[PDB]
Design a protein around this ligand. Sequence first.
Ligand SMILES: Cc1cc2nc3c(=O)[nH]c(=O)nc-3n(C[C@H](O)[C@H](O)[C@H](O)COP(=O)(O)OP(=O)(O)OC[C@H]3O[C@@H](n4cnc5c(N)ncnc54)[C@H](O)[C@@H]3O)c2cc1C
Ligand SMILES: Cc1cc2nc3c(=O)[nH]c(=O)nc-3n(C[C@H](O)[C@H](O)[C@H](O)COP(=O)(O)OP(=O)(O)OC[C@H]3O[C@@H](n4cnc5c(N)ncnc54)[C@H](O)[C@@H]3O)c2cc1C
Lengths: 163, 165
Amino acid sequence: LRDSRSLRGIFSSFATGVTVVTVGGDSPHAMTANSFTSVSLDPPLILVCVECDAAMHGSLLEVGSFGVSVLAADQQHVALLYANRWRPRDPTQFDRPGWARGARTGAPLARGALAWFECALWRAYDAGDHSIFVGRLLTAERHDRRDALVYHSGQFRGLPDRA
Amino acid sequence: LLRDSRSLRGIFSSFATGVTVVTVGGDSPHAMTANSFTSVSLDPPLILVCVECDAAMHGSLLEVGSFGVSVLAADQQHVALLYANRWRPRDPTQFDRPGWARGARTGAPLARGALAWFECALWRAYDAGDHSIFVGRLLTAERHDRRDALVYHSGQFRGLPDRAP
Ligand SMILES: Cc1cc2nc3c(=O)[nH]c(=O)nc-3n(C[C@H](O)[C@H](O)[C@H](O)COP(=O)(O)OP(=O)(O)OC[C@H]3O[C@@H](n4cnc5c(N)ncnc54)[C@H](O)[C@@H]3O)c2cc1C
Ligand SMILES: Cc1cc2nc3c(=O)[nH]c(=O)nc-3n(C[C@H](O)[C@H](O)[C@H](O)COP(=O)(O)OP(=O)(O)OC[C@H]3O[C@@H](n4cnc5c(N)ncnc54)[C@H](O)[C@@H]3O)c2cc1C
């Protein structure tokens, strides 16, 4: 239980979709998250868990709102990039055609995603080495159903789906 | 459209998940199906689940203060359905049947054939609208044989192929 590689392994038995959480503002940023969870319908709430030592932890608190893009299976590379701590953190990357801007927050939203969310930060709860960020939905939108990106047993997987 | 439940649930459904059964032991053992299960922290080892305020498990979790979590394999769809059924028989005797083990630390039922088992002590229960977020500190955790996983996506149950090398 004290071993990270082992415990991460047990955790990996639970399959997930994959998202990219984003902020806009002066210093736009993006990161890959699979801790995304639908929480409540009234009021409409979701949550994500972000490492305390991660840059997005501070950005979320600074900006107070965020975007979420649920990734299709052909967006594995997007998932990989924004999980990469060594990545370019340059705001120019979000001006590329692969990004849309949320109508409500201006947060980057990944084109081709299965779905988009914009949220206002409702609360941030302590949770050990992570914090639980609860967002109240401002906008939400589902796109064409197609194969979904899935993360299971530490592997990226494609989940077939069609309307 | 955010005011419409079916519309919004449809959008939420675009995010695929595995499926668990959350359980308590004690005098009135109980179980419920949950896909809001999420790994939260490694130090200390924490997980969370989101449980409806009006759901019976909401009270059981608070009353008993510890719980089990079983991650379901693809051939356990019927388990997911059963313990998602509000009309289900609620006799505690069912958790004495052979498809269940009892967690050594919590006595919570754990489903045999599951991909993984967790036992947890309730750390905190946080308000979250019509749900509460229950954060559990792990007392035990154990991974079993890798095999096809139960996945819930687009409001459908799916099998996700998986096998040890
Ligand atoms: C499928 C997948 C799902 C994921 N889900 C989540 C999730 O739900 N929640 C979550 O928090 N993460 C998650 N991650 C990991 C996350 O995507 C990466 O950690 C990402 O790079 C974090 O972005 P960041 O800018 O917010 O934090 P970063 O600044 O990139 O920090 C990431 C970690 O690396 C350390 N670090 C980074 N750069 C340095 C540096 N120069 N020097 C010293 N230390 C450094 C940090 O201390 C931190 O612990 C996931 C990754 C994958 C592949
Ligand atoms: C893949 C899947 C994933 C799921 N994930 C979650 C999750 O993460 N969190 C969660 O909370 N649920 C989740 N559910 C639903 C949950 O499993 C069911 O609601 C289950 O019945 C709850 O069990 P319970 O005894 O704890 O609550 P219950 O007592 O069964 O109540 C469940 C709901 O039904 C109502 N209800 C039941 N009986 C009555 C009654 N006599 N009179 C009036 N109202 C009644 C309650 O108002 C309540 O809203 C999921 C279901 C599925 C199929």
